[PDB]
Amino acid sequence: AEQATKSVLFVCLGNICRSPIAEAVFRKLVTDQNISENWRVDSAATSGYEIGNPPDYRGQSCMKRHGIPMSHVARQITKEDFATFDYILCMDESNLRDLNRKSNQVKTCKAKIELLGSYDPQKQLIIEDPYYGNDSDFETVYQQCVRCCRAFLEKAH
Description:
It is classed as hydrolase. By secondary structure, the protein is α/β, with parallel strands linked by helices. The protein has a single domain (1-157), classed as Response regulator (Rossmann fold), CATH 3.40.50.
């Protein structure tokens, strides 16, 4: 069989709490759907705050609670990312302003920059930073991501 390979980059401020979860949730969805070979999935940060670090351990526990595998080393977004990805899905409006600012200094911007939450059937538009919160906040990020990723897949390019 054969088909066009699409690519999605999930983005947040530090790439330690939110985006690694979104990436891991999406990655599993496509693997369960038998279409993983058609997708290139990654996640990155708008800042250099946490470069080289594993996901927030609280997010890791949350994921294990749901049996979702998660491995990632934080990295910041690059000028190249705007040319190579079809979709750049971010968590909040601060991420969006930043991405748009960066995208405007790039020669080739192939990516469609959007809020991941714009795909939520329930309209929880923003996926808020759970860093200063606790476990329930991470479970909310997870639930939001499962809802948005499922819906995004139904309409994807």
